[PDB]
UniProtKB/Swiss-Prot annotation:
Disorder this protein is connected to according to its UniProt record: Retinal dystrophy with leukodystrophy: An autosomal recessive disorder characterized by progressive leukodystrophy associated with developmental delay, spastic paraparesis, ataxia, and retinal dystrophy. Patients may show facial dysmorphism. Laboratory investigations reveal an abnormal profile of very-long chain fatty acid in plasma.
Natural source organism: Homo sapiens
Name of the featured protein: Acyl-CoA-binding domain-containing protein 5
Sequence similarity: Belongs to the ATG37 family.
Chain residues that bind an acyl-CoA: 14-23, 34-38, 60, 79
Location of this fragment in the whole protein: 41 to 130 of 534
Domain of life assignment: Eukaryota
Residue ranges occupied by any ACB domain in the UniProt entry: 3-92
Function: Acyl-CoA binding protein which acts as the peroxisome receptor for pexophagy but is dispensable for aggrephagy and nonselective autophagy. Binds medium- and long-chain acyl-CoA esters.
Annotated compartments: Peroxisome membrane
């Protein structure tokens, strides 16, 4: 599908920024990207929240859980739209 192809292209773009540029998305933005990636591929968050002692686990889970019943296609659209917005503002 058009959205699935766009999604794969976008994922590649984001993956490449910490490797091929001098600038990358913020940690906050990376968690947002993770949330849409999970929602697009695995669907809605299923598991219980990690414990207080696992910060990155908790930040991850909170971001993914936040999306609720977002569909897989909506999460692909969201990921792509977020990537476009970052690329529009960020020196490459």
């Amino acid at each position: 599908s058009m959205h699935e192809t766009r999604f794969e292209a976008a994922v590649k773009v984001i993956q490449s920024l910490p490797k091929n540029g001098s600038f990358q998305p913020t940690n906050e933005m990376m968690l947002k990207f993770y949330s849409f990636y999970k929602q697009a591929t695995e669907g809605p968050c299923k598991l219980s929240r990690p414990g207080f002692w696992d910060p990155i686990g908790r930040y991850k889970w909170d971001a993914w859980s936040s999306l609720g019943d977002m569909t897989k296609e909506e999460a692909m659209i969201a990921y792509v739209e977020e990537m476009k917005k970052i690329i529009e503002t960020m020196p490459m």
